[PDB]
Every structure is written in C-alpha cells, then in structure tokens.
C-alpha cells in the first residue's frame, strides 16, 4: 500500500509495455551519470526490438545483448539527451536477430541489426552493439539535407525524457542545488527578482545585512540595560 512512486505521482505515465516497462524503474542518479551517452544532436528516436522465444543458439544470445542495451545503455540516452525518445519493445515470438530502429529529425530511420559474434560476452556484446549506433549510425545523421529546417525542430522538440523516474539520491533534486558548486550566470535577469511584496526587507534578513540603515532607538535602550 506504500505508494513507492509518491514523488512521481505527477509525472506522465511511460509507454507501459512488455519490454519497455523498465522505463519506470526508479533510476538512481548514481547509476545514471555512470553512463553519459551523448548521441548526435540530430537524432529523434531510438527503438530496440527483441523477442521472448529464440530457437537459434546464437539468436538466444542476440536477444540478450539487445536485452541488456535496453536495460542499461538506453535510458541514459533518454535522460541525458532529452530530445531522443527511447522505446524497447519485446515481440513475443521466435526470432534470430533483434533490431535497432533509429530515427532522425528528417524522418530517415535506419537499420541496425544486433548480430553479436559467437565468442562475445553480454558485456562486450553491448559495447560493439552500442558503438555501431552511437558512432556508425548517428554521427552519419550529419548528412542532413537542409541543416536549418532540421534544426528549428530541435529548438522546438519538447523534452521527451519527462516520463523517466530519477531518484536524485543525496544529490539535490533541483537542478541548481545539484550543481551547488558552480557559479552559473545562466540566470535570466527578470527571473531572479524576488517579488515578495516586501523585497529588500526580507532580502536583507536572509543574507543578514543591514543596508546602511540606522539602528532602532530600542537598541541603545537595551545596551543601557545590559550594563553591569
């Protein structure tokens, strides 16, 4: 009955699916930030499709390396980039090769076949499989036709990575208090103004500053009374 997601009760609902429900696993901000994957700025969607049953003894492995890349090496792509929508869906049927369907801001979806070589491991398998996307398939999205029209969308693409759940453990839960060790100058001057109906009167209390003001007469009345 404990509402485990009581902080995320206002966030959108992820695309709940069979192999896509690990978009609502509560990500520790220390497991994130352990994988900062920065995909080319012209990438719109990353899709992973694997199976539940496999027959070929290599197919049983290819559906595992693609499985892990969904668990580990896919949500950090969403959390960090925030313009890349990430969806890993398992198809409940026999198969050999899972897919990776990466879209681009032009509409140019490409092909990534998850073919791990026989003697690889599930750890090494992903690094070969992830590199084939992050470098070979995404950096080649720098061949866009009209490099402006495909940019104004990026400056229009609303942040897709809202649905994710990050548990900012001992890190701050607010973008500024997370930094907390970096001067910013990212502020927009209008936003910083207090507007609290007695600003420069509370503001002097917070930073504990008098403001060239004179002490109330009540102060010498008390000092006279704190004598001997």
């Amino acid at each position: 009955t404990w509402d485990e997601l009581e902080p995320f009760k206002g966030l959108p609902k992820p695309k709940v699916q069979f192999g896509n429900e690990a978009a609502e696993v509560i990500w520790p901000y220390a497991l994130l930030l352990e994988n900062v994957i920065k995909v080319h700025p012209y990438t719109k969607s990353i899709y992973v499709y694997y199976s539940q049953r496999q027959s070929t003894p290599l197919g049983e492995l290819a559906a595992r390396v693609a499985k892990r890349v969904s668990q580990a090496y896919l949500i950090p792509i969403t959390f960090h980039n925030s313009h890349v929508y990430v969806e890993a869906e398992m198809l409940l049927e026999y198969s050999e090769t899972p897919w990776v369907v990466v879209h681009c801001l032009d509409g140019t979806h490409k092909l990534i076949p998850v073919k791990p070589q026989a003697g690889q491991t599930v750890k090494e398998g992903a690094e070969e499989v992830l590199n084939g996307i992050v470098s070979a398939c995404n950096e080649i999205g720098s061949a866009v036709k009209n490099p402006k029209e495909v940019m104004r969308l990026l400056s229009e693409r609303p942040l897709q990575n809202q649905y994710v759940r990050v548990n900012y453990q001992w890190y701050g839960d607010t973008p500024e208090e997370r930094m907390s060790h970096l001067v910013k100058w990212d502020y927009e001057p209008e936003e910083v103004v207090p507007q609290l109906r007695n600003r420069t009167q509370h503001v002097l209390d917070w930073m504990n500053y008098d403001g060239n003001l004179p002490t109330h007469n009540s102060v010498r009345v008390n000092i006279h009374r704190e004598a001997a």
Partner: peptide
C-alpha cells in the same frame, strides 16, 4: 551541449564523445 557534464566527476567519469574542431 558538447560539455557541461563536469559535475560529480568520480561519480560521473563516464562519457562517449570525441571533440570536433569543425
């Protein structure tokens, strides 16, 4: 966004990026 990921360095310490001059 090439940079701005210098926060929490030992805990971060992870990147997948190569600098391009042009």
């Amino acid at each position: 966004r090439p940079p701005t990921d210098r926060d929490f360095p030992a805990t971060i310490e992870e990147y997948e990026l190569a600098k391009h001059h042009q």
